[model samples]
Target chain A: MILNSFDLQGKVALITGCDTGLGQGMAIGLAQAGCDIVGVNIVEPKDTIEKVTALGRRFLSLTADMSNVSGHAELVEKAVAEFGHVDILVNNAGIIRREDAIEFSEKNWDDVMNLNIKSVFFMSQTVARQFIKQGKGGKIINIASMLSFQGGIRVPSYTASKSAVMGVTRLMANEWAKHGINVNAIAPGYMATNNTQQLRADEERSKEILDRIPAGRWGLPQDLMGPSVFLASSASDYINGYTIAVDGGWLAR
Target chain B: MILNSFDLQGKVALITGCDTGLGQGMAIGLAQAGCDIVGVNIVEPKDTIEKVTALGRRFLSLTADMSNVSGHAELVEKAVAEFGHVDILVNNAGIIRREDAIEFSEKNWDDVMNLNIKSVFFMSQTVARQFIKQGKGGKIINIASMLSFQGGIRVPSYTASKSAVMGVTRLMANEWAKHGINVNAIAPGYMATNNTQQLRADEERSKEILDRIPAGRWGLPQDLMGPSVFLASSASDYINGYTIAVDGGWLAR
Candidate 1:
């Protein structure tokens, strides 16, 4: 009876970076639980769409480059044009370039920041405006990182972008809360994703991550879906501007 | 040089509700690390003050009704009167009342919310005024809870107050960040404090809690020491309006 809070049946969700990795996991996770998905990708993985369809849910495939701002508005209009109305928006796509901070190129920094932070804000704004028109609340889930809290080695732009994501989330929620839009971010820990495969494959860095995370193991992409569901549903009615870490005790240690 | 971010040495901190809960642990924890202690209490403990003083740090004891706004000022004034100035303020003093939602008494509800939420806000406000006047930044740590996220069984008012505490932390930060006062909160997991001894003494509930935590144990009040130091020190200088959960993976699970 109390399951109403976290259930996602019949909801339509839009997820960026859905070609593979964390976005793909959430797409399949949410689809398995009865959510129809609109998976956007730069290099769209055909299998993800087939999998969503196999789960007996509607799936829309869109090719969008996050570096472009007008592409965000076009995608918002595209999603609503195709899906009837957007219920959930997942800003899960991010990129990082590991160069020396002093030598990091302006173009590289801007490119990472554009996709990681800027796209999410503009996409959320466009979708939120639609939600206001429909007079129904919507959830905008931003994919932040452990970097959101810590300034780690060699990823200055990633760090700055995520820090800004946290800032914009609070700023957005302040205006949107009264309008019934819940804007929050999830800072997932060292999860096994395609993007982070190289880090975990490194023997020394992997051990450091494992030792710091009191949970005795790395996070799986599947670990984040419950929190995503929690925040997306009625269960989190009062929750706003909060950044939850699905890190398996990484920060605690 | 980084040590200056949160140098409690030669400074003083006043923690309210300093009996045997989070407050008592925090008071001694800070004292052991160099800060002088001013412990506030309504119920006297067996050795809280002695424990603080035993660390070779000055200990001042005060008794006042913390539910009132004036009490917040009085407590700060008393601490200032004895220790000269408060460099850190930990609003760890709070009360809780448990009863079925509709059947809960308004008196119990207001009483708990007043001490838990209202006092913390007004206390930080008064303390920030002092810290800013002294021309230095200060740390204000409010002890928040997992109840700050989920709505609980029999404490509607507590749930409401905690969620408010979360909001107030951000509001306080947004207002004071430029003034160099960084406000933060700690949402701790279940701990075996003197007050929670009854629940901890329940073998079944204790075992259940232990099993559910990904870290495989309920937290100790001392478990919060590292995070408290991080937030109090310049170590968390860029962090503001944030709540670090020292929950041993209860929330993560």
Candidate 2:
């Protein structure tokens, strides 16, 4: 009963930020779960394209920087043209700014908010419009963060942006559930990625973080593979408006 | 800066199911977080008592069967006697039975529902009453499961119970947020514990589960430590009705 619902055969997923990190991992996982990918990124994600193609799933690369909503609708139209249909959307492109609350600039705040929250809202709106036109349901998975639930120090803008992502996730889920769109979010933990290079480079900070996690290690790109597949599939149709943390019990700690 | 909010210097926590497993882990973790313990269980947890006391935190064990609602109020009343005030309540007591949905008996269904959902609700109701009486808000953490989001195999009652647990978490948060009572949950992923020893012992099932986990390992009891403290302290005051997964990125994968 559990595994049967995860089949994504013939489905198409349009995921943002597939250039690398969590987005790339999620794109490949979706492909392995049987869905072809239309990956949108500022640069060509050759590695993600190769992996998805190797899985025998079609991979379409759409070049777009999700800093503004100028081309959100056009991107979805392009994806639809390439795949003929889009059944899932992963809003994974995001930016973070680390500055103390006292010194954090308005530009830093606007940059993270515009890309992470504004782009996500309009992108989902574009995809949902297509889903409505197609007269079928769809799945939307937003990439959130632990900061969504907690006020992390320094990264005030990053914290606010991620927190809004979760809020918007719930709002969209409530509004779009009737349209058969199941919206959810995945909040990753202290993952070992190029994104966290600075934290990992600081021996004391890195060690302190590691010592606190219950799993006794950092998370990896491959870690999100299963979750991405599950959320992107019908297996999680009943689940909505929830931000599930994959933090090696980082929050548990 | 991240760790600054995790202080429980003079707080008190009343936790259920301290006899073994996650409850024991959470109780100890709370003690380590600088909170005195008021543990309620059907049986006395000598090991838990010893560990909490060893940490120089006072331990009070209140004997009660959580399946029935008869003594919920009395349990909290007695706990208050030891610490004079209660700052936190961890609803960690739960049970699971494995049988195909078609063959599942009403008794099995009721057994889990009574403790997992009914008792959890009433227990939180009692603690919330105390939190309301105390004037200052308090923390209440519920132990949720992966089943809270996914429908697992052969465990209909457990899945339903955990799922309801998540829903009630939100409902209660909505009603109690104004009261400043933060109701949250921790859903631990597949872990190495006596409760899951059978699943781990079956070579095929074990391997399948392990290979699917992003963290590539079973979670330890220690994983719940940081989470318990973070949620129990001011660190996560703004977070409400969230089920934080500490499952080694199991949900992400």
Candidate 3:
């Protein structure tokens, strides 16, 4: 019975930037948990659609550049139209620009901030309203990073935005819990995804990372599956305003 | 298959202060998950023994004052004597002393620090050696508090101890990961227990506390069951040095 609480059957989840990497992984995971998936990305997620549909779940693909927050409402509106109601939101659309703090540009700062933190807050607000209108509780899962807790090298805006993501997660949970909306976050450690292809390709940096991780290997997309499903389901109903690190002991070091 | 990772069959877990409350709850939960329990309390935990034994798992009760570090090594020796090996260690023995910061006494500071953080580190060191000797990695779950992240009211020593617990969790994980030891913590939100009886009895104080929590209710000992099991089992193999909040969104507000 405790395990059954993790089932997300008869639910619908809206995820942003599901074309690749962590977003794609979480989208498929939510689908596996029995939620209809509405994916918003800059381009059509062909592979993601195939994967979700193969899992026998509906996949609604929408296109929009997330750096522009103006389209968030429209995206959720379309999701509601297709699924009747939305039960969960995973703010997985994020971009990172690396630059030394001393030379970090205004453009880099604004770009990462807009997509990572600004879009996340507004999108959560949009879906939370629908949750309130439906008079039922919902779940919001934000994608955070190790930078959220630590100061990483040459990533000023990424650190700022990710840290802001953790703070706003708590603030949103404070305001939305009365509406039965649980706002939480998942801070993934280094993963073997397209986003980290460059780092993985660097032998020195890659070896350094592997040495620090207790798991002694880079994380895979499948690693996020269990945590993603757990946070989105009733099993974590009493848990809120928290960020879970799926890192393989990166912060510990 | 994902759910099967949570099973703890044949594992032995040693928990401190399992006479009552959260420690007792975790002991019972671990037993139900098929783990034999070794409880170290200053007094015999009759209720804990009964419940764990009812689950058809072995219960080894050891009595010692955890505030004194001298007994920690002997404690683990006795445990290994009875169980052969320990797969998990729950450092749940802790104390709290509340007073105005300006007038906080040396006695209060030393008392809480000795038991909460000091005992935790040495106890961990002792068991980690055994884990290395056995050539099998083990799990160590430290008990942290909301104060580990936030500054709470009038509990100066408690805040210091809990904060150190989080830091040492990260530090320990950093040092011992190569040995396959996973060091993590759980920060339980406000719970209804003997420890909070005074605050709960104060109507005005209770309402103020309740209003801030998103769950709109106090946490129960049972609330820690799932999280305790997950961290103790293989389910959390990739998670380390992180403190998972089991509060009902208390920190969010």
Candidate 4:
């Protein structure tokens, strides 16, 4: 018999960076899985709001530039005010800067690190604190990358940030398991999105990549939805500190 | 600059269970990446032989029941006879048993454990002995399952065997890292295979499974090629003790 570990009928999810791409995909996925969403994004996530509300779930948009950590507290507070409690946290907001390691700028490095790793930690810490206060555990799903496990080219800061994110994920899981808090990361494979448009447009690189992907196709945002919901639900309670790759077997071939 | 750690020119890979499905896919992938294939299966792998030779690589098949550990030593010896040296070992042969946990049979449990866990261990131990004698570090990739990470219904022995596989993978990695042996596992997501025929035939079960998969489609054997190659080749030299999933982001949604 199946349990309601996946039924988020009354739970609230505070998801970051849901304006577009994977964030949007995750927000809608959680909504469909039965959770109300409180999304933090720099720009208004109009489409995400529509999809969530259409599913008969609430979606509150909190505009903020995630590179700065100042707004994290208020964001969590507002989420609690609206939903009474936040049961899940999806740390999907992130930025990437592509440049060779030799010529990569300080500004670019700081930008990626601050937003990706630094902000992710503080936000998770903030939400975790709230969970402690409520006397109930919570789920934290961090968005990691294949780079978390492999050293990819020309994105030194991205690789470092992502690699560190995995380390942080493990560390948190070890310390928080007693609290009933489950921490994990999801590393998405090469997906077709605005971020990957340039790579897809490069014919030679595109073919080379496609030839390596066993699925014989680039992944799309919708591909990430089920996994996000799974991690957010009780289905993944025993799973902790794992960077589950949804790479169409990108790591398997 | 990307180094050709992925280059498998002149390497010999002894892959288990290469008669069909994922084993055949991994064999072909390794061949395409420039490795000669020495396959092990209970039956003669005629199709695998054709594809490996078509890629201009040698395929030597050794028929043996993987559950019978008595044949493991001879299996490794025959591979060395054909290839001169074995540089990679893909432990892909496995078995499964299904029944409610309360009513699971000891015979069924023993069958799955004997083949999946015990056979895999002896095969790997035998191969590692060869790798050690060759004086060059080798790669050993074990075939893990999603059940390794999650507890699903009606498959007690399968889940136990897979979960133990991952644990052994880690334990081996820690001990063998000094020997330059990279031990890892490839956890393939839901795929269209004979093992899953019953589940796929049940329309309700099929739709529910499909609905959770982000790729919006069942995985094909071809999808495992690149990942298998990447792991078996120099590309994943630094990766050890990881259960890499090729699930089209099935775990990420």
Tell me the DockQ of each model, to 2 decimals: 0.05, 0.04, 0.44, 0.03
- Superposed model 4: Cα runs more than 4 Å off: B1-114, B117-253
lDDT of 4 by residue, A1-253 (tens): 0123345678899999898898888888788778899999888899999888888888999999776778889989999998899989998888899998999999989999999999999999999989888878889999888899889989999999999998888777666655767788888878888878999999999999877654456777776776676667654454556686766445645
| Chain B alone vs. reference chain B, TM-score for every model | 0.94, 0.98, 0.98, 0.96
Model 2 steric clash pairs: A226-B253, A227-B252, A227-B253, A249-B246, A252-B227, A253-B226, A253-B227
lDDT against the true structure, each candidate: 0.82, 0.89, 0.87, 0.80
lDDT ranking, best first:
2, 3, 1, 4
Q: Top DockQ: which candidate number?
A: 3
Query: Compared with the true structure, what per-residue lDDT tens digits does model 4 show for residues B1-253?
Result: 1123445789999998888888888898788778998888889999999989998888888888988888889989988987799999999988788889999999989999998999999899999999889888888999888898889989999999999998888767655645767788878878788778899999999999877664456766766665666567544444566686665445544
- Model 4: fraction of native contacts: 0.01
Regarding DockQ, does 2 or 3 come out ahead?
3
User: How does model 4 score on DockQ?
Assistant: 0.03
The DockQ-based order of candidates, best leading, equals 3, 1, 2, 4
Residue A176 CA error for candidate 2 (Å)?
Answer: 12
Reproduced native contacts, each prediction: 0.00, 0.00, 0.53, 0.01
Score every model by TM-score.
Answer: 0.56, 0.56, 0.88, 0.57
Instruction: List the candidate 3 regions with Cα displacement exceeding 4 Å.
Output: A31-36, A43-64, A67-74, A77-84, A99-111, A151-156, A212-215, B54-56, B68-70, B77-84, B99-107, B151-154
Best candidate according to TM-score = 3
Those runs of model 2 whose alpha carbons end farther than 4 Å from true positions after fitting are A1-253, B1-4
